Write an enzyme that holds these catalytic residues in place. Sequence first.
Site, PDB file in Angstrom:
ATOM      1  CB  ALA A  34      37.464 -21.680  14.752  1.00 29.30           C
ATOM      2  CG  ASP A  35      32.843 -18.798  16.585  1.00 27.99           C
ATOM      3  OD1 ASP A  35      34.053 -18.816  16.893  1.00 27.99           O
ATOM      4  OD2 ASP A  35      31.886 -19.060  17.346  1.00 27.99           O
ATOM      5  CB  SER A  36      34.548 -14.092  13.189  1.00 26.66           C
ATOM      6  OG  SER A  36      33.527 -13.522  13.976  1.00 26.66           O
ATOM      7  CG  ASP A  38      37.402 -20.829  18.472  1.00 27.32           C
ATOM      8  OD1 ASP A  38      38.495 -21.034  17.905  1.00 27.32           O
ATOM      9  OD2 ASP A  38      36.970 -21.434  19.478  1.00 27.32           O
TER      10      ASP A  38
END
Length: 77
Positions: A34-36, A38
């Site tokens: 989960a990227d920054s 998400d």
Amino acid sequence: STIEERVKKIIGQQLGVKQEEVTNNASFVEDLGADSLDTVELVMALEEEFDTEIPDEEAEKITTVQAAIDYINGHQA
């Protein structure tokens, strides 16, 4: 309707996966990735989810699924 039962929802959702996908001993940082963009939308929502201002401290056991479910469960106590 366990505590995590409600956390998993918003959780897996914030990512884009059914509540079944969100395992217990997983990781929304690597397992899912989960990227920054998400992760944020995750907490932000998680907060309002139960109208709570997740404090920095608590901001530790919220990198995976169960983690959050644990925070929303009884909050790191």
